[PDB]
Paper text:
Analogous to ubiquitination, ufmylation is carried out by a three-enzyme cascade involving E1, E2, and E3 proteins. The adenylated [name] is then subjected to a nucleophilic attack by the catalytic C250 of [name] to form a thioester bond with the C-terminal glycine of [name]. However, [name] does not harbor such a domain but instead has a short sequence called UBS that is responsible for the interaction with UFC128.
As expected, the double mutant kept the overall UBC fold as observed in WT [name] with an RMSD of 0.3 Å2. The main differences were concentrated in the loop harboring the active site Cys. Specifically, Leu 117 Cα moves 1.7 Å away from its position in the WT, and its side chain points towards the position of the missing phenylalanine ([name]). This movement is not feasible in the WT due to steric clashes with F121. Then, to understand how these conformational changes affect [name] transfer, we examined our model suggesting that [name] Y372 utilizes a cavity on the [name] surface. While in WT this cavity has a volume of 377 Å3, in the double mutant it becomes 126 Å3. This change probably hampers the ability of [name] Y372 to occupy this pocket and therefore affects the recruitment of [name] linker to the active site Cys. Taken together, our results suggest that changes in the cavity volume of [name] due to the double mutant interferes with the ability of [name] to execute its role in desolvation, and accordingly, increasing the pH helps to overcome the defect in transfer.
Residue numbers in the entry: 0 to 163
Amino acid sequence: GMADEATRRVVSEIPVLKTNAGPRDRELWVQRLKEEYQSLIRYVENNKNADNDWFRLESNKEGTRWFGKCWYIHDLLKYEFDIEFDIPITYPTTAPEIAVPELDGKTAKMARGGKICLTDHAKPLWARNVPKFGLAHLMALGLGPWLAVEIPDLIQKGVIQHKE
């Protein structure tokens, strides 16, 4: 009830994805990537209009490896972190693990390699929606909220610092 409204509020304007394909699925994967880029770019364009342009992502030729940056603003200071992840073979049933390698071991809510610990509520929400959610949804529902909890906590603990 409140959980559905919370999800719909956060992702309502992100194009939904269609194609149930992973990295090895040839022409279906090429179509999945079109959907992924279509969703990511609309998300960014929406983020710009809302003065919340908070990440850049790109893939390799095959779309098996993604990398870019996210930005978090705290008390008017902008923190930039490099991000990267591999697409699992069983994607998009299986959610990718976003790695922020520079924050590795600096918070408990994180596995080895700076793979962010994705909440017990977010994983089944992804599971129920398959294959409608893509990387745009993973950023909006996964990394977005994680940064809004961990970046402030890390700045306060003095373990993360500001660069020009």
